[PDB]
Design a binder for this molecule. Structure first.
Ligand SMILES: *[C@@H]1O[C@H](CO)[C@@H](O[C@@H]2O[C@H](CO)[C@@H](O[C@@H]3O[C@H](CO)[C@@H](O)[C@H](O)[C@@H]3O)[C@H](O)[C@H]2NC(C)=O)[C@H](O)[C@H]1NC(C)=O
Ligand SMILES: *[C@@H]1O[C@H](CO)[C@@H](O[C@@H]2O[C@H](CO)[C@@H](O)[C@H](O)[C@H]2NC(C)=O)[C@H](O)[C@H]1NC(C)=O
Ligand SMILES: *[C@@H]1O[C@H](CO)[C@@H](O[C@@H]2O[C@H](CO)[C@@H](O)[C@H](O)[C@H]2NC(C)=O)[C@H](O)[C@H]1NC(C)=O
Ligand SMILES: *[C@@H]1O[C@H](CO)[C@@H](O[C@@H]2O[C@H](CO)[C@@H](O)[C@H](O)[C@H]2NC(C)=O)[C@H](O)[C@H]1NC(C)=O
Ligand SMILES: *[C@@H]1O[C@H](CO)[C@@H](O[C@@H]2O[C@H](CO)[C@@H](O)[C@H](O)[C@H]2NC(C)=O)[C@H](O)[C@H]1NC(C)=O
Ligand SMILES: *[C@@H]1O[C@H](CO)[C@@H](O)[C@H](O)[C@H]1NC(C)=O
Ligand SMILES: *[C@@H]1O[C@H](CO)[C@@H](O)[C@H](O)[C@H]1NC(C)=O
Ligand SMILES: *[C@@H]1O[C@H](CO)[C@@H](O)[C@H](O)[C@H]1NC(C)=O
Ligand SMILES: *[C@@H]1O[C@H](CO)[C@@H](O)[C@H](O)[C@H]1NC(C)=O
Ligand SMILES: *[C@@H]1O[C@H](CO)[C@@H](O)[C@H](O)[C@H]1NC(C)=O
Ligand SMILES: *[C@@H]1O[C@H](CO)[C@@H](O)[C@H](O)[C@H]1NC(C)=O
Lengths: 322, 419, 215, 100, 49
């Protein structure tokens, strides 16, 4: 009855938290639900010598989660008037979205994101990825086994890195840590007295008369309402930051998983080839496959060449001598 | 919503808040029955009855004790009243002087033996004791005063036997007329009337019971002044022998020890949860489903509206269609195995809609999309032979309403004092 | 003389069971690595009480038998007297003294209850007298003085006496060493295991590492 | 109480202004990259291969009409990466080697 | 001593300001520290005119 004198403070916090809870499911929908048809791979797993056994789903697990997704789920580790709502999309549905996106990317490339899925051999697809970054496609077909071996070794190093170092998922650990710390501080603000005589209402209402026991209860009510308002404001700011990160994640998914990126250092260092999505507790993990030049050599160059009084300029490439 | 028309969606209204109806009070049984049996003229038999809870209900309810006058406090509140000391003065008083035992009243004993103040806080219990204090040819064991130099003041320790001198002749240890002794005998006999009969007068100059235990039901409880509301559930937490309460991480009362039997009780404060309302628009229909968040479906009919509860309805809570989701308990919707697009979300992959299976609210698992398989081969490609031109629409907000606030006018209407 | 108290003097501040948690409190505690006063029995001089007294006794023959408390100890006002007479424990508040030189062969209150180390804490808050104790067997010798380790102290006796105490003196038996320390208001971070036993404690005002631990 | 009630409103307006400013920056980026040019970014301006866009005003906002090219009628073909001819490996300069 | 009764508000503001102060240095590092090796120019400052 004393709290009823305050008005709409007690309901606008509910409205703000309901808006945040809707916005989380909107973020998850916008990040993961970008494909309309749930694709799946053929049972033959010969993708030009490229090994995809670590990111494709394994039927031995109960859920349809891969080995890398299981490692990511293993690396990532309230009662008094507080409820934690479950997410609308369960982890099985998120894993089905990531499996569909990865299967569509492997079997088609650009075309399942640009429209209907178009099958193409994976060697030809990666040759077109090479032709998209200024390297002629004969370099792939003359080095296909070497490229497949390098990709298999680079995939195999990631499992060792994730098993050894668990501090890579700092942001996904920090989301859970921030929510747990905020809830713990909000609960532990109950035991404070806020300048009143006691933190228990029964002691105030039994050991004191009503005409200033109401004032002491008013002090306690004002302190607890201020704590609730501070928690709601911090949740609003954190929700805005998480929404910005989710928009960036959806942008990277659309421009690197569903296609090929020409933006410098947007998706991995070097010249970008393709990408893989993996689900994670409160997040997404992209495996960026990129092309990095390695072994330099000196050459003597020139802008053009005289020949019978005519200046010849190269159509593609530079001039070298030795 | 503060509106007469409700649009389609899920809306949260109130909380579940299962309420108790029973109270348990528990205390140790060391009531410390004070030794009133050892109690019930000048050198008092004043016994400092202390360090115990006094039960005057025995003296009030048993047969022989008759008078129950009380001053300072009400005579019916005595069993609820605690004392630093209970000064009990068991006396043998003649009834004509029993009538003088009052706050502010004079008389023979009240003027010459001892005095009581006008603001006296105490009780007087008396009964005739002729067979214990009356002797043949008079009882001379009790001596009283009919002479004194000057009137008394309350609680003045005066025990003397000196001769009071009234005449001009100095007495000095020799008695006589106008050489009066203080001590005179009323000489109690069994043949006297009620006004001359002796009374056994005790001037008492100046606790909650424990109830039986109820387990596995959410009740209000009190354990040695620790009050709470919850389910007193039997537990197995190893308390230290001096430790009587258990606390959580959040410094809340998680476990208690009963003062009568050394058992460890875990406490769960009933059950609570948001009562969300799942409805289509009131433009279409008025059929409503109800979702209790975080509550098992086997405990909502236990905490039905007949029990004290913040929900107080039974139209959409009387069983019938009851489904258990990971969000909680959904009442009023039927689970359909067919998967559609999500119309009204619930949680954990459950959605609800208004469909003709005539029309009713149904619940289902959401459908991700159409199943597809790409015919991948290492020598086959698929090339389009035609196209289409698509013009899509994308809508973006740019700027909202600009506002301005006059704080002085908002806080103070037209008050110069408020300014 | 003085010696090192190490991490001794940790008692249970309340009758609250906590399971596997780190709880921070601010009470009258003995500081870690403080100068605890050393005494050997061949005397028993009258010592101040202050806010509280931590007592430690290392003996096997049970020479130390009790304590006497009081503001003046001149048989004019109330004066505490706790004596173990090898069968029971007797607590009295009488004015008079049992012997002119204190040894072992109207009162408003009366209560009857190097292989040995007994630890005690006596404190007086709003007149209420609280005694914490811990009796343990030890193997080591009288060099190393107090044993370097950890042990929690459990409450035994609460008294409603309301008697001011500023001076106290131990009472022996005539027909062993002891240590006296003083309690100060300190903040301690106590560690509770699964069974509620205080397994370890951190003194928040000792060094910046423990200050960071309490932070 | 009234000052706190005003402060809460101003704080929520600040948060909403930050969100609206982020949306306006996104709209300006979309207008600059799709109305004033052609976008190679996948699914930035309409699904499919982006051709052009048209801006329209709206109450408190903007509406983009994205004209895009979507391939429609598919056909299977038998493909190969290169072709042997007189001991030489011929690769296509652009396009796909197919066979019916 | 009166301020000790209010609670953990001071620790809340210290934690928030510490997070902001860490985030400023993280922003500066993310903007500028995008190179691995510190490159230096050749001593002859002639680049095509
Ligand atoms: C692609 O990579 C996977 C994983 O590296 C290859 O599958 C086989 O995976 C198992 C572990 O999952 C490797 O270890 C083997 O485990 C079994 C069961 O524990 C054990 O009995 C064996 O002695 C061995 O330790 C196994 O070596 C690996 N197989 C091979 C041939 O490496 C998969 O074969 C790879 N596919 C391609 C096309 O390279
Ligand atoms: C209170 O009095 C009763 C005496 O009955 C004690 O409670 C139990 O009573 C039953 C009755 O036969 C005995 O068998 C038990 O041994 C008693 N004790 C327990 C722990 O159950 C009880 O000890 C007394 N005191 C308190 C504080 O309750
Ligand atoms: C809700 O209550 C039901 C009660 O049936 C729980 O289901 C199990 O029911 C069987 C009886 O057939 C019990 O023996 C089991 O102990 C119950 N399981 C559990 C975990 O208690 C159901 O699990 C409950 N749902 C909850 C608690 O979420
Ligand atoms: C490719 O598709 C177009 C679109 O349907 C075909 O063109 C005609 O389009 C009009 C309106 O768009 C339809 O009413 C006609 O029925 C279409 N013609 C036919 C024969 O269906 C076009 O014919 C298709 N094929 C090509 C270009 O080879
Ligand atoms: C290219 O050939 C493949 C041959 O498998 C076609 O895939 C089949 O398509 C039919 C028609 O939708 C399905 O019923 C079969 O289930 C598909 N096969 C498999 C193994 O899934 C494919 O549709 C052809 N594509 C084109 C453009 O003609
Ligand atoms: C190169 O060719 C040009 C034109 O044919 C000629 O004038 C010149 O002498 C040649 N040699 C050099 C060193 O430029
Ligand atoms: C759904 O499937 C289960 C399992 O086959 C079956 O028992 C149940 O009757 C089905 N319900 C409907 C509405 O089809
Ligand atoms: C190409 O695919 C067929 C099945 O369609 C498979 O049998 C064959 O082994 C594959 N080619 C190579 C080189 O593995
Ligand atoms: C403790 O005693 C030693 C030796 O008597 C002395 O050096 C030291 O200063 C003392 N420390 C304190 C805090 O009294
Ligand atoms: C002894 O009696 C006197 C007089 O009543 C009193 O003041 C004093 O406190 C008593 N001593 C004790 C130890 O109670
Ligand atoms: C010790 O004191 C108690 C209480 O005064 C008494 O009951 C007991 O007999 C005494 N023991 C000896 C050995 O004197």
């Amino acid at each position: 009855n004393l709290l009823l004198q305050y008005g709409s403070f007690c309901t606008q916090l509910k409205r703000a938290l309901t808006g945040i809870a809707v916005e989380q499911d909107k973020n998850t929908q916008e990040v993961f639900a970008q494909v309309k048809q749930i694709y799946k791979t053929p049972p033959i797993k010969y993708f030009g010598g490229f090994n995809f056994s670590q990111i494709l789903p394994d039927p031995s697990k109960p859920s349809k989660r891969s080995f890398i997704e299981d490692l990511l789920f293993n690396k990532v580790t309230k009662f008094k008037g507080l409820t934690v709502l479950p997410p609308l999309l369960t982890d099985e549905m998120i894993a089905q979205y990531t499996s569909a996106l990865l299967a569509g990317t492997i079997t088609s490339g650009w075309t399942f994101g640009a429209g209907a899925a178009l099958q193409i051999p994976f060697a030809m697809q990666m040759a077109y990825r090479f032709n998209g970054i200024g390297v002629t496609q004969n370099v792939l077909y003359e080095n296909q086994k070497l490229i497949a071996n390098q990709f298999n070794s680079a995939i195999g190093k990631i499992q060792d890195s994730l098993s050894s170092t668990a501090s890579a998922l700092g942001k996904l650990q920090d989301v859970v840590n921030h929510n747990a710390q905020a809830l713990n501080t909000l609960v532990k603000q109950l035991s404070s007295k806020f300048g009143a005589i006691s933190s228990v209402l029964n002691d105030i209402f039994s050991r004191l008369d009503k005409v200033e026991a109401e004032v002491q209860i008013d002090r306690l009510i004002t302190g607890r309402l201020q704590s609730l308002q501070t928690y709601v404001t911090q949740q609003l700011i954190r929700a805005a930051e998480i929404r910005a990160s989710a928009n960036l994640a959806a942008t990277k998914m659309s421009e690197c998983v569903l296609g090929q990126s020409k933006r410098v250092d947007f998706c991995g260092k070097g010249y970008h080839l393709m990408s893989f999505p993996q689900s994670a507790p409160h997040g997404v993990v992209f495996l960026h496959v990129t092309y990095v030049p390695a072994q330099e050599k000196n050459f003597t160059t020139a802008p053009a060449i005289c020949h019978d009084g005519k200046a010849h300029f190269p159509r593609e490439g530079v001039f070298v001598s030795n | 919503l503060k509106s007469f028309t409700v649009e389609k969606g899920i809306y949260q209204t109130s909380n579940f808040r299962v309420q108790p109806t029973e109270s348990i009070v528990r205390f140790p049984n060391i009531t410390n029955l004070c030794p009133f049996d050892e109690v019930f003229v000048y050198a008092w038999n004043r016994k400092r009855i202390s360090n115990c809870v006094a039960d005057y209900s025995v003296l009030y309810n048993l047969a022989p004790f008759f008078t129950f006058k009380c001053y300072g406090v009400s005579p019916t509140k005595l069993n609820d009243l605690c004392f630093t000391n209970v000064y009990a003065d068991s006396f043998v008083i003649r009834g004509d002087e029993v009538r003088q035992i009052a706050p502010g009243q004079t008389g023979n004993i009240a003027d010459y033996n001892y005095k009581l103040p006008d603001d006296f806080t105490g009780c007087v219990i008396a009964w005739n004791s002729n067979k214990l204090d009356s002797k043949v040819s008079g009882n001379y064991n009790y001596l009283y005063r009919l002479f004194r130099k000057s009137n008394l003041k309350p609680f003045e320790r005066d025990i003397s036997t000196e001769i009071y001198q009234a005449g001009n002749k100095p007495c000095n240890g020799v008695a006589g007329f106008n050489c009066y002794f203080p001590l005179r005998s009323y000489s109690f006999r069994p043949t006297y009337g009620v006004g001359h009969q002796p009374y056994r007068v005790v001037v008492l100059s100046f606790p909650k019971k424990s109830t039986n235990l109820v387990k596995n039901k959410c009740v209000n409880f009190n354990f040695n002044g620790l009050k709470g509301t919850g389910v007193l559930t039997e537990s197995n937490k190893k308390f230290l022998p001096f430790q009587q309460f258990g606390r959580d991480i959040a410094d809340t009362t998680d476990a208690v020890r009963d003062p009568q039997t050394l058992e460890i009780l875990d406490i769960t404060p009933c059950s609570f949860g948001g009562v969300s309302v799942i409805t289509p628009g009131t433009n279409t229909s008025n059929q409503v489903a109800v979702l209790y968040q975080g509550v098992n479906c086997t405990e909502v009919p236990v905490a039905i509206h007949a029990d004290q509860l913040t929900p107080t309805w039974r139209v959409y809570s009387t069983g019938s269609n009851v489904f258990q989701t990971r969000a909680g308990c959904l009442i009023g919707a039927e689970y359909v195995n067919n998967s559609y697009e999500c119309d009204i979300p619930i949680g954990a992959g459950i959605c609800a809609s208004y469909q003709t299976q005539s029309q009713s609210i149904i619940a289902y698992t959401m459908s991700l999309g159409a199943e597809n398989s790409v015919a991948y081969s290492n020598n086959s490609i698929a090339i389009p032979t035609n196209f289409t031109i698509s013009v899509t629409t994308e809508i973006l907000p740019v700027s909202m309403t600009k506002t301005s606030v006059d704080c002085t006018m908002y806080i103070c209407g037209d008050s110069t004092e408020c300014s | 003389a003085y010696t090192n108290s190490f991490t001794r003097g940790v008692y249970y501040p309340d009758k609250v069971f906590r399971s596997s948690v780190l709880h921070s409190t601010q009470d009258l505690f003995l500081p870690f690595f403080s100068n605890v006063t050393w005494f050997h029995v061949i005397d028993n001089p009258v010592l101040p009480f202050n806010d509280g007294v931590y007592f430690a006794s290392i003996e096997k023959s049970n020479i130390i038998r009790g304590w006497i408390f009081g503001t003046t100890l001149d048989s004019k006002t109330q004066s505490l007297l706790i004596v173990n007479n090898a069968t029971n424990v007797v607590i009295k508040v009488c004015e008079f003294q049992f012997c002119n030189d204190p040894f072992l062969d109207n009162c408003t209150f009366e209560y009857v209850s190097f292989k040995n180390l007994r630890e005690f804490v006596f404190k007086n808050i709003d007149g209420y007298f609280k005694i914490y104790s811990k009796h343990t067997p030890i193997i080591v010798r009288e060099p190393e003085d107090l044993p370097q380790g950890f042990s929690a102290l459990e409450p035994l006796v609460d008294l409603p006496i309301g008697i001011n105490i500023t001076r106290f003196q131990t009472l022996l038996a005539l027909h062993a060493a002891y240590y006296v320390g003083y309690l100060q208001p300190r903040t301690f971070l106590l560690k509770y295991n699964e069974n509620g036993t205080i397994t370890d404690a951190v003194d928040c005002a000792l060094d910046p590492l423990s200050e960071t631990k309490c932070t």
